[PDB]
Amino acid sequence: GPHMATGQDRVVALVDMDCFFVQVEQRQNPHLRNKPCAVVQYKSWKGGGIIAVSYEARAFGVTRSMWADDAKKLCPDLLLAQVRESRGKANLTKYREASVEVMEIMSRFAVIERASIDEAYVDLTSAVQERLQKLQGQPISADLLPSTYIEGLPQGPTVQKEGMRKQGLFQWLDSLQIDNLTSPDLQLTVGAVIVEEMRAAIERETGFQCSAGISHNKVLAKLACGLNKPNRQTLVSHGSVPQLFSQMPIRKIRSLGGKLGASVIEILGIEYMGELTQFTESQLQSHFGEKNGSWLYAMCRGIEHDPVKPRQLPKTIGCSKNFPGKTALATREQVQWWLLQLAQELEERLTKDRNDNDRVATQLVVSIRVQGDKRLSSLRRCCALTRYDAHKMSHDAFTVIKNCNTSGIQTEWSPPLTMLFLCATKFSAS
DNA sequence: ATTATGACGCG
DNA sequence: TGCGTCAT
Ligand SMILES: Nc1ncnc2c1ncn2[C@H]1C[C@H](O)[C@@H](COP(=O)(O)OP(=O)(O)OP(=O)(O)O)O1
Ligand SMILES: [Ca+2]
Numbered sequence: 001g002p003h004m005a006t007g008q009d010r011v012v013a014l015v016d017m018d019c020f021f022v023q024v025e026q027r028q029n030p031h032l033r034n035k036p037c038a039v040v041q042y043k044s045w046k047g048g049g050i051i052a053v054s055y056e057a058r059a060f061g062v063t064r065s066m067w068a069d070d071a072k073k074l075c076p077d078l079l080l081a082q083v084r085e086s087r088g089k090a091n092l093t094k095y096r097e098a099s100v101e102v103m104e105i106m107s108r109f110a111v112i113e114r115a116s117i118d119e120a121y122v123d124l125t126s127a128v129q130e131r132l133q134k135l136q137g138q139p140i141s142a143d144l145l146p147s148t149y150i151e152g153l154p155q156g157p158t159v160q161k162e163g164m165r166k167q168g169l170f171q172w173l174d175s176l177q178i179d180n181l182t183s184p185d186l187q188l189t190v191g192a193v194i195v196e197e198m199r200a201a202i203e204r205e206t207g208f209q210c211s212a213g214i215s216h217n218k219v220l221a222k223l224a225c226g227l228n229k230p231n232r233q234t235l236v237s238h239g240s241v242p243q244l245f246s247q248m249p250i251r252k253i254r255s256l257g258g259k260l261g262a263s264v265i266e267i268l269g270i271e272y273m274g275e276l277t278q279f280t281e282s283q284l285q286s287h288f289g290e291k292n293g294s295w296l297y298a299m300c301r302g303i304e305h306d307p308v309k310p311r312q313l314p315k316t317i318g319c320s321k322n323f324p325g326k327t328a329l330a331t332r333e334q335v336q337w338w339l340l341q342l343a344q345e346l347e348e349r350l351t352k353d354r355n356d357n358d359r360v361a362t363q364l365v366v367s368i369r370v371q372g373d374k375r376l377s378s379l380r381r382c383c384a385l386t387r388y389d390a391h392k393m394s395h396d397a398f399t400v401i402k403n404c405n406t407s408g409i410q411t412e413w414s415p416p417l418t419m420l421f422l423c424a425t426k427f428s429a430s
Numbered sequence: 431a432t433t434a435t436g437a438c439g440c441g
Numbered sequence: 442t443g444c445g446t447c448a449t
Binding site for chain 3: 258375
Binding site: 041092 | 431432435436439
Protein backbone atom coordinates (compact mmCIF):
# COMPACT_ATOMS: atom_id res chain seq x y z
CA GLY A 1 0.00 0.00 0.00
CA PRO A 2 1.45 3.32 1.27
CA HIS A 3 4.82 1.75 2.11
CA MET A 4 5.42 -0.31 -1.03
CA ALA A 5 8.21 1.32 -3.05
CA THR A 6 7.52 1.58 -6.77
CA GLY A 7 10.96 2.49 -8.09
CA GLN A 8 9.68 5.67 -9.72
CA ASP A 9 12.17 7.98 -7.99
CA ARG A 10 14.46 8.70 -10.95
CA VAL A 11 14.33 9.52 -14.64
CA VAL A 12 17.06 7.58 -16.49
CA ALA A 13 17.80 7.40 -20.20
CA LEU A 14 19.99 5.13 -22.27
CA VAL A 15 21.28 6.49 -25.58
CA ASP A 16 22.56 3.94 -28.10
CA MET A 17 24.07 5.04 -31.45
CA ASP A 18 22.54 3.32 -34.49
CA CYS A 19 24.88 0.95 -36.37
CA PHE A 20 27.71 3.03 -34.95
CA PHE A 21 30.87 2.04 -36.84
CA VAL A 22 28.86 2.11 -40.06
CA GLN A 23 27.70 5.68 -39.42
CA VAL A 24 31.29 6.71 -38.70
CA GLU A 25 32.36 5.32 -42.07
CA GLN A 26 29.31 6.80 -43.86
CA ARG A 27 29.95 10.29 -42.53
CA GLN A 28 33.50 10.05 -43.87
CA ASN A 29 32.57 8.51 -47.23
CA PRO A 30 29.25 9.83 -48.60
CA HIS A 31 29.24 7.04 -51.24
CA LEU A 32 28.30 4.68 -48.40
CA ARG A 33 25.30 6.72 -47.21
CA ASN A 34 21.83 5.17 -47.52
CA LYS A 35 23.30 1.91 -48.84
CA PRO A 36 23.51 -1.68 -47.66
CA CYS A 37 26.96 -1.54 -46.14
CA ALA A 38 29.04 -3.08 -43.39
CA VAL A 39 32.28 -2.53 -41.53
CA VAL A 40 34.78 -5.38 -41.72
CA GLN A 41 38.14 -6.17 -40.15
CA TYR A 42 40.93 -8.16 -41.89
CA LYS A 43 40.14 -8.70 -45.60
CA SER A 44 42.27 -11.80 -46.36
CA TRP A 45 40.42 -14.50 -44.43
CA LYS A 46 37.01 -15.11 -46.03
CA GLY A 47 36.62 -11.46 -47.01
CA GLY A 48 36.98 -10.21 -43.45
CA GLY A 49 34.86 -10.40 -40.31
CA ILE A 50 31.79 -8.14 -40.21
CA ILE A 51 31.54 -6.05 -37.05
CA ALA A 52 28.79 -3.55 -37.93
CA VAL A 53 25.88 -3.53 -40.41
CA SER A 54 23.65 -0.78 -41.85
CA TYR A 55 19.91 -1.25 -41.51
CA GLU A 56 19.64 -1.48 -45.31
CA ALA A 57 22.03 -4.46 -45.23
CA ARG A 58 20.26 -6.08 -42.26
CA ALA A 59 17.16 -6.39 -44.47
CA PHE A 60 19.15 -8.89 -46.55
CA GLY A 61 20.08 -10.91 -43.45
CA VAL A 62 23.61 -9.59 -43.08
CA THR A 63 24.75 -9.79 -39.47
CA ARG A 64 27.72 -9.22 -37.19
CA SER A 65 30.19 -12.14 -36.95
CA MET A 66 29.42 -13.12 -40.54
CA TRP A 67 32.35 -13.43 -42.97
CA ALA A 68 32.09 -10.83 -45.75
CA ASP A 69 32.30 -13.57 -48.38
CA ASP A 70 29.17 -15.07 -46.84
CA ALA A 71 27.45 -11.69 -46.46
CA LYS A 72 28.00 -11.15 -50.20
CA LYS A 73 26.00 -14.32 -50.86
CA LEU A 74 22.98 -12.72 -49.17
CA CYS A 75 23.65 -9.20 -50.44
CA PRO A 76 25.79 -9.08 -53.61
CA ASP A 77 25.73 -5.27 -53.71
CA LEU A 78 26.91 -4.99 -50.10
CA LEU A 79 29.39 -2.13 -49.73
CA LEU A 80 32.26 -2.50 -47.28
CA ALA A 81 34.44 -0.21 -45.19
CA GLN A 82 37.61 -1.64 -43.63
CA VAL A 83 38.88 -1.06 -40.11
CA ARG A 84 42.27 0.68 -40.16
CA GLU A 85 45.29 -1.54 -39.63
CA SER A 86 48.45 -0.36 -37.93
CA ARG A 87 51.42 -2.30 -36.57
CA GLY A 88 49.95 -5.52 -37.92
CA LYS A 89 46.62 -5.20 -36.09
CA ALA A 90 43.17 -3.63 -36.34
CA ASN A 91 43.19 -0.15 -34.87
CA LEU A 92 39.91 1.26 -33.55
CA THR A 93 41.02 4.87 -33.00
CA LYS A 94 38.57 6.41 -35.49
CA TYR A 95 35.63 4.89 -33.60
CA ARG A 96 37.00 5.80 -30.16
CA GLU A 97 37.36 9.42 -31.29
CA ALA A 98 33.85 9.47 -32.77
CA SER A 99 32.60 8.15 -29.43
CA VAL A 100 34.24 11.02 -27.59
CA GLU A 101 32.38 13.42 -29.91
CA VAL A 102 29.03 12.03 -28.83
CA MET A 103 29.86 11.59 -25.15
CA GLU A 104 30.99 15.21 -24.87
CA ILE A 105 27.70 16.45 -26.37
CA MET A 106 25.65 14.28 -24.02
CA SER A 107 27.60 15.59 -21.05
CA ARG A 108 26.26 19.09 -21.77
CA PHE A 109 22.78 17.91 -20.79
CA ALA A 110 23.53 15.72 -17.79
CA VAL A 111 26.03 13.53 -15.98
CA ILE A 112 26.62 10.41 -18.05
CA GLU A 113 27.83 6.88 -17.44
CA ARG A 114 29.82 5.56 -20.41
CA ALA A 115 28.42 2.06 -20.87
CA SER A 116 30.31 1.13 -24.03
CA ILE A 117 31.89 2.73 -27.09
CA ASP A 118 28.49 3.93 -28.29
CA GLU A 119 26.12 3.81 -25.29
CA ALA A 120 25.68 6.09 -22.31
CA TYR A 121 23.24 6.24 -19.41
CA VAL A 122 21.94 9.64 -18.37
CA ASP A 123 20.39 10.54 -15.02
CA LEU A 124 17.82 13.17 -15.94
CA THR A 125 16.11 13.47 -12.56
CA SER A 126 17.48 16.95 -11.80
CA ALA A 127 17.12 18.27 -15.36
CA VAL A 128 13.50 17.17 -15.39
CA GLN A 129 12.76 19.03 -12.16
CA GLU A 130 14.26 22.22 -13.60
CA ARG A 131 12.36 21.96 -16.90
CA LEU A 132 9.12 21.30 -15.01
CA GLN A 133 9.66 24.54 -13.09
CA LYS A 134 10.15 26.51 -16.31
CA LEU A 135 7.03 24.90 -17.81
CA GLN A 136 4.85 26.03 -14.90
CA GLY A 137 1.85 23.74 -15.38
CA GLN A 138 1.98 24.26 -19.14
CA PRO A 139 0.90 21.15 -21.12
CA ILE A 140 3.37 19.15 -23.19
CA SER A 141 2.75 19.33 -26.94
CA ALA A 142 3.13 16.22 -29.10
CA ASP A 143 5.27 18.45 -31.29
CA LEU A 144 7.95 18.28 -28.58
CA LEU A 145 8.09 14.49 -28.99
CA PRO A 146 8.48 13.97 -32.76
CA SER A 147 10.30 10.63 -32.55
CA THR A 148 8.92 9.19 -29.27
CA TYR A 149 6.99 5.94 -28.81
CA ILE A 150 4.99 5.25 -25.66
CA GLU A 151 5.30 1.52 -25.01
CA GLY A 152 1.93 -0.16 -24.57
CA LEU A 153 -0.04 2.44 -26.51
CA PRO A 154 -2.23 2.88 -28.36
CA GLN A 155 -4.69 0.51 -26.67
CA GLY A 156 -8.42 0.04 -26.17
CA PRO A 157 -11.53 1.24 -28.07
CA THR A 158 -4.24 3.86 -39.15
CA VAL A 159 -2.34 0.87 -40.50
CA GLN A 160 1.03 2.63 -40.83
CA LYS A 161 3.86 2.77 -38.29
CA GLU A 162 3.97 6.55 -37.85
CA GLY A 163 0.20 6.69 -37.51
CA MET A 164 0.37 4.21 -34.65
CA ARG A 165 3.18 6.15 -32.96
CA LYS A 166 1.13 9.35 -32.95
CA GLN A 167 -2.04 7.61 -31.80
CA GLY A 168 -0.16 6.15 -28.84
CA LEU A 169 1.49 9.47 -28.06
CA PHE A 170 -1.86 11.25 -28.19
CA GLN A 171 -3.45 8.81 -25.74
CA TRP A 172 -0.51 9.21 -23.37
CA LEU A 173 -0.54 13.00 -23.44
CA ASP A 174 -4.33 13.18 -23.20
CA SER A 175 -4.15 11.22 -19.95
CA LEU A 176 -1.23 13.17 -18.48
CA GLN A 177 -1.83 15.22 -15.33
CA ILE A 178 0.51 18.18 -15.83
CA ASP A 179 -0.80 19.64 -12.58
CA ASN A 180 1.42 17.54 -10.31
CA LEU A 181 5.18 18.18 -10.49
CA THR A 182 5.76 14.86 -8.71
CA SER A 183 3.79 12.63 -11.09
CA PRO A 184 6.27 9.96 -12.26
CA ASP A 185 4.59 9.70 -15.67
CA LEU A 186 4.89 13.46 -16.17
CA GLN A 187 8.53 13.31 -15.11
CA LEU A 188 9.23 10.58 -17.68
CA THR A 189 7.49 12.65 -20.34
CA VAL A 190 9.62 15.70 -19.62
CA GLY A 191 12.61 13.36 -19.66
CA ALA A 192 11.62 12.27 -23.15
CA VAL A 193 11.41 15.91 -24.25
CA ILE A 194 14.95 16.49 -23.04
CA VAL A 195 16.17 13.33 -24.77
CA GLU A 196 14.59 14.53 -28.03
CA GLU A 197 16.67 17.69 -27.57
CA MET A 198 19.82 15.71 -26.74
CA ARG A 199 19.40 13.44 -29.76
CA ALA A 200 18.80 16.46 -32.01
CA ALA A 201 22.04 18.05 -30.78
CA ILE A 202 23.98 14.83 -31.39
CA GLU A 203 22.70 14.64 -34.94
CA ARG A 204 23.21 18.34 -35.69
CA GLU A 205 26.74 18.40 -34.29
CA THR A 206 28.11 15.03 -35.46
CA GLY A 207 25.80 13.81 -38.21
CA PHE A 208 25.13 10.65 -36.16
CA GLN A 209 21.65 9.26 -35.40
CA CYS A 210 20.77 7.23 -32.32
CA SER A 211 17.94 5.59 -30.43
CA ALA A 212 17.12 6.08 -26.75
CA GLY A 213 15.07 4.59 -23.94
CA ILE A 214 13.53 6.67 -21.16
CA SER A 215 12.31 5.05 -17.94
CA HIS A 216 12.85 5.00 -14.17
CA ASN A 217 16.06 2.93 -14.09
CA LYS A 218 18.94 1.66 -16.23
CA VAL A 219 17.55 -1.79 -17.00
CA LEU A 220 14.19 -0.47 -18.22
CA ALA A 221 15.86 2.35 -20.14
CA LYS A 222 18.09 -0.14 -21.95
CA LEU A 223 15.14 -2.43 -22.66
CA ALA A 224 13.09 0.53 -23.85
CA CYS A 225 15.84 1.74 -26.18
CA GLY A 226 15.79 -1.47 -28.22
CA LEU A 227 12.03 -1.44 -28.72
CA ASN A 228 12.06 1.06 -31.59
CA LYS A 229 15.35 1.24 -33.48
CA PRO A 230 16.70 2.97 -35.42
CA ASN A 231 16.44 6.74 -34.99
CA ARG A 232 13.57 6.62 -32.46
CA GLN A 233 13.13 6.80 -28.71
CA THR A 234 10.82 4.88 -26.40
CA LEU A 235 9.30 5.77 -23.04
CA VAL A 236 8.56 2.81 -20.77
CA SER A 237 6.39 3.87 -17.86
CA HIS A 238 6.08 1.97 -14.59
CA GLY A 239 2.49 1.15 -15.53
CA SER A 240 3.58 -0.42 -18.81
CA VAL A 241 5.69 -3.04 -17.03
CA PRO A 242 3.18 -5.83 -16.28
CA GLN A 243 2.03 -6.11 -19.91
CA LEU A 244 5.53 -5.60 -21.34
CA PHE A 245 7.01 -8.28 -19.10
CA SER A 246 4.15 -10.74 -19.59
CA GLN A 247 5.61 -11.97 -22.88
CA MET A 248 9.22 -10.77 -22.52
CA PRO A 249 11.78 -13.56 -22.72
CA ILE A 250 14.00 -13.52 -19.64
CA ARG A 251 17.17 -13.32 -21.78
CA LYS A 252 16.14 -9.90 -23.07
CA ILE A 253 16.80 -8.19 -19.74
CA ARG A 254 20.33 -6.89 -19.18
CA SER A 255 22.49 -9.36 -17.19
CA LEU A 256 20.15 -12.28 -17.90
CA GLY A 257 21.30 -12.94 -21.48
CA GLY A 258 23.70 -15.69 -20.41
CA LYS A 259 24.11 -18.58 -17.97
CA LEU A 260 22.21 -16.95 -15.09
CA GLY A 261 19.17 -16.26 -17.26
CA ALA A 262 19.30 -19.83 -18.53
CA SER A 263 19.39 -21.07 -14.93
CA VAL A 264 16.39 -18.91 -13.99
CA ILE A 265 14.46 -20.49 -16.86
CA GLU A 266 15.53 -24.05 -16.11
CA ILE A 267 15.23 -24.00 -12.33
CA LEU A 268 11.93 -22.13 -12.13
CA GLY A 269 10.38 -23.62 -15.26
CA ILE A 270 9.32 -20.25 -16.65
CA GLU A 271 9.98 -18.31 -19.86
CA TYR A 272 8.94 -14.68 -19.36
CA MET A 273 10.09 -11.94 -17.03
CA GLY A 274 6.60 -11.38 -15.61
CA GLU A 275 6.40 -14.96 -14.38
CA LEU A 276 9.06 -14.11 -11.80
CA THR A 277 6.53 -12.18 -9.70
CA GLN A 278 5.06 -15.41 -8.32
CA PHE A 279 8.13 -16.29 -6.24
CA THR A 280 9.01 -14.82 -2.86
CA GLU A 281 12.23 -12.85 -2.45
CA SER A 282 13.61 -15.69 -0.27
CA GLN A 283 12.73 -18.28 -2.90
CA LEU A 284 14.69 -16.34 -5.51
CA GLN A 285 17.60 -15.83 -3.14
CA SER A 286 17.60 -19.56 -2.43
CA HIS A 287 18.36 -20.40 -6.05
CA PHE A 288 20.33 -17.43 -7.32
CA GLY A 289 21.99 -16.00 -4.22
CA GLU A 290 21.17 -13.09 -1.92
CA LYS A 291 22.20 -10.35 -4.34
CA ASN A 292 20.71 -11.80 -7.55
CA GLY A 293 17.59 -12.95 -5.74
CA SER A 294 16.81 -9.50 -4.37
CA TRP A 295 17.64 -7.98 -7.74
CA LEU A 296 15.28 -10.36 -9.57
CA TYR A 297 12.50 -9.81 -7.05
CA ALA A 298 12.55 -6.07 -7.63
CA MET A 299 13.38 -6.16 -11.35
CA CYS A 300 10.42 -8.30 -12.40
CA ARG A 301 8.27 -5.56 -10.84
CA GLY A 302 10.10 -2.90 -12.88
CA ILE A 303 12.24 -1.80 -9.94
CA GLU A 304 16.03 -1.47 -9.89
CA HIS A 305 18.40 0.84 -8.04
CA ASP A 306 21.79 0.67 -9.79
CA PRO A 307 22.90 4.31 -9.99
CA VAL A 308 24.06 6.13 -13.10
CA LYS A 309 27.75 6.37 -12.25
CA PRO A 310 29.51 9.68 -12.90
CA ARG A 311 32.05 8.30 -15.36
CA GLN A 312 32.64 9.49 -18.92
CA LEU A 313 36.09 7.96 -19.49
CA PRO A 314 36.98 4.28 -19.82
CA LYS A 315 38.68 2.75 -16.73
CA THR A 316 41.12 0.69 -18.79
CA ILE A 317 43.01 1.04 -22.05
CA GLY A 318 43.89 -2.23 -23.70
CA CYS A 319 44.84 -3.86 -26.94
CA SER A 320 44.86 -7.44 -28.08
CA LYS A 321 45.42 -9.69 -31.04
CA ASN A 322 44.53 -13.28 -31.82
CA PHE A 323 46.90 -15.59 -33.67
CA PRO A 324 44.51 -18.34 -34.84
CA GLY A 325 45.18 -21.83 -36.20
CA LYS A 326 48.40 -21.76 -38.19
CA THR A 327 49.50 -18.26 -37.16
CA ALA A 328 49.93 -19.23 -33.49
CA LEU A 329 53.16 -17.71 -32.15
CA ALA A 330 55.69 -20.51 -31.68
CA THR A 331 59.00 -18.70 -31.14
CA ARG A 332 60.21 -16.44 -28.33
CA GLU A 333 61.19 -13.97 -31.07
CA GLN A 334 57.64 -13.84 -32.44
CA VAL A 335 56.16 -13.43 -28.97
CA GLN A 336 58.57 -10.53 -28.42
CA TRP A 337 57.88 -8.72 -31.68
CA TRP A 338 54.10 -8.88 -31.30
CA LEU A 339 54.20 -7.80 -27.67
CA LEU A 340 56.15 -4.80 -28.92
CA GLN A 341 53.56 -3.96 -31.57
CA LEU A 342 50.80 -4.08 -28.95
CA ALA A 343 52.92 -2.02 -26.56
CA GLN A 344 53.54 0.66 -29.18
CA GLU A 345 49.82 1.08 -29.80
CA LEU A 346 49.21 1.11 -26.03
CA GLU A 347 51.95 3.72 -25.51
CA GLU A 348 50.39 5.95 -28.15
CA ARG A 349 46.93 5.72 -26.63
CA LEU A 350 48.22 6.15 -23.09
CA THR A 351 50.23 9.26 -23.91
CA LYS A 352 47.19 10.84 -25.55
CA ASP A 353 45.06 9.80 -22.58
CA ARG A 354 47.50 11.41 -20.12
CA ASN A 355 47.52 14.70 -22.04
CA ASP A 356 43.75 14.86 -22.46
CA ASN A 357 42.55 13.50 -19.15
CA ASP A 358 45.16 14.35 -16.52
CA ARG A 359 45.68 10.80 -15.32
CA VAL A 360 48.23 8.00 -15.49
CA ALA A 361 47.84 4.22 -15.53
CA THR A 362 49.81 2.45 -12.81
CA GLN A 363 49.33 -1.22 -13.62
CA LEU A 364 50.01 -3.25 -16.74
CA VAL A 365 47.96 -6.41 -17.17
CA VAL A 366 49.34 -9.10 -19.48
CA SER A 367 47.14 -11.92 -20.75
CA ILE A 368 47.69 -14.76 -23.19
CA ARG A 369 45.90 -17.77 -24.59
CA VAL A 370 47.46 -21.18 -25.21
CA GLN A 371 46.43 -23.35 -28.15
CA GLY A 372 43.61 -25.75 -27.29
CA ASP A 373 42.07 -23.85 -24.38
CA LYS A 374 38.38 -23.11 -24.99
CA ARG A 375 38.64 -20.15 -22.62
CA LEU A 376 39.12 -16.70 -24.15
CA SER A 377 41.98 -16.17 -21.69
CA SER A 378 44.28 -18.87 -20.35
CA LEU A 379 46.28 -16.63 -18.04
CA ARG A 380 46.59 -13.11 -16.60
CA ARG A 381 49.51 -11.51 -14.78
CA CYS A 382 50.20 -7.94 -13.71
CA CYS A 383 53.28 -5.78 -13.24
CA ALA A 384 53.97 -2.14 -12.46
CA LEU A 385 53.35 0.40 -15.21
CA THR A 386 55.91 3.01 -14.21
CA ARG A 387 56.86 4.54 -17.57
CA TYR A 388 54.89 5.16 -20.75
CA ASP A 389 57.55 3.42 -22.85
CA ALA A 390 56.62 0.79 -25.42
CA HIS A 391 59.95 -1.03 -25.24
CA LYS A 392 59.83 -1.16 -21.44
CA MET A 393 56.20 -2.25 -21.30
CA SER A 394 56.78 -5.02 -23.87
CA HIS A 395 59.91 -6.20 -22.07
CA ASP A 396 58.09 -6.31 -18.73
CA ALA A 397 55.16 -8.15 -20.27
CA PHE A 398 57.53 -10.78 -21.65
CA THR A 399 59.39 -11.16 -18.36
CA VAL A 400 55.99 -11.78 -16.76
CA ILE A 401 54.85 -14.49 -19.21
CA LYS A 402 58.15 -16.09 -20.26
CA ASN A 403 57.68 -18.76 -17.58
CA CYS A 404 54.79 -20.20 -19.60
CA ASN A 405 57.07 -21.62 -22.27
CA THR A 406 57.07 -25.38 -21.63
CA SER A 407 59.72 -25.71 -24.34
CA GLY A 408 63.07 -27.31 -23.59
CA ILE A 409 64.83 -25.59 -26.45
CA GLN A 410 65.43 -22.01 -25.27
CA THR A 411 64.51 -20.45 -28.62
CA GLU A 412 61.09 -22.02 -29.26
CA TRP A 413 57.71 -21.51 -27.55
CA SER A 414 55.31 -24.27 -26.48
CA PRO A 415 52.51 -24.57 -26.63
CA PRO A 416 51.99 -21.84 -29.26
CA LEU A 417 50.19 -18.66 -28.15
CA THR A 418 46.89 -17.90 -29.88
CA MET A 419 46.20 -14.54 -28.19
CA LEU A 420 48.18 -11.64 -26.71
CA PHE A 421 46.57 -8.91 -24.57
CA LEU A 422 48.05 -5.81 -22.88
CA CYS A 423 45.89 -3.61 -20.69
CA ALA A 424 46.69 -0.45 -18.75
CA THR A 425 44.69 -0.08 -15.54
CA LYS A 426 44.50 1.54 -12.10
CA PHE A 427 44.58 5.20 -13.09
CA SER A 428 45.68 7.93 -10.70
CA ALA A 429 45.37 11.69 -11.15
CA SER A 430 48.39 13.42 -12.70
C1' DA B 431 40.02 -18.63 -37.99
C1' DT B 432 35.33 -13.96 -35.34
C1' DT B 433 38.06 -10.19 -33.34
C1' DA B 434 38.82 -6.31 -30.46
C1' DT B 435 37.43 -4.40 -26.97
C1' DG B 436 35.34 -3.01 -21.80
C1' DA B 437 33.00 -3.37 -16.75
C1' DC B 438 32.02 -5.90 -12.67
C1' DG B 439 31.23 -9.74 -8.82
C1' DC B 440 33.12 -13.66 -6.36
C1' DG B 441 36.50 -15.24 -3.64
C1' DT C 442 44.97 -10.75 -6.15
C1' DG C 443 42.86 -14.01 -11.07
C1' DC C 444 38.83 -15.80 -13.19
C1' DG C 445 34.38 -16.05 -14.98
C1' DT C 446 30.53 -13.69 -16.73
C1' DC C 447 28.09 -10.42 -19.50
C1' DA C 448 28.11 -6.96 -22.54
C1' DT C 449 29.39 -3.66 -27.06
N1 LIG D 1 31.28 -8.38 -31.02
C1 LIG D 1 31.85 -7.24 -31.49
N2 LIG D 1 33.12 -7.26 -32.00
C2 LIG D 1 33.69 -6.14 -32.46
N3 LIG D 1 33.04 -4.97 -32.44
C3 LIG D 1 31.78 -4.91 -31.95
C4 LIG D 1 31.15 -6.05 -31.46
N4 LIG D 1 29.91 -5.69 -31.05
C5 LIG D 1 29.78 -4.35 -31.28
N5 LIG D 1 30.92 -3.90 -31.83
C6 LIG D 1 31.23 -2.51 -32.24
C7 LIG D 1 30.71 -2.19 -33.64
C8 LIG D 1 29.38 -1.52 -33.37
O1 LIG D 1 28.99 -0.62 -34.42
C9 LIG D 1 29.62 -0.80 -32.05
C10 LIG D 1 28.31 -0.67 -31.29
O2 LIG D 1 27.79 -1.98 -31.08
P1 LIG D 1 26.22 -2.29 -30.99
O3 LIG D 1 25.52 -1.20 -30.25
O4 LIG D 1 26.08 -3.68 -30.43
O5 LIG D 1 25.66 -2.39 -32.50
P2 LIG D 1 25.50 -1.24 -33.61
O6 LIG D 1 25.63 0.14 -33.02
O7 LIG D 1 26.38 -1.59 -34.78
O8 LIG D 1 24.00 -1.50 -34.10
P3 LIG D 1 22.62 -1.05 -33.36
O9 LIG D 1 22.03 -0.04 -34.29
O10 LIG D 1 21.88 -2.36 -33.30
O11 LIG D 1 22.96 -0.52 -32.00
O12 LIG D 1 30.55 -1.63 -31.33
CA1 LIG E 1 24.57 0.83 -31.05
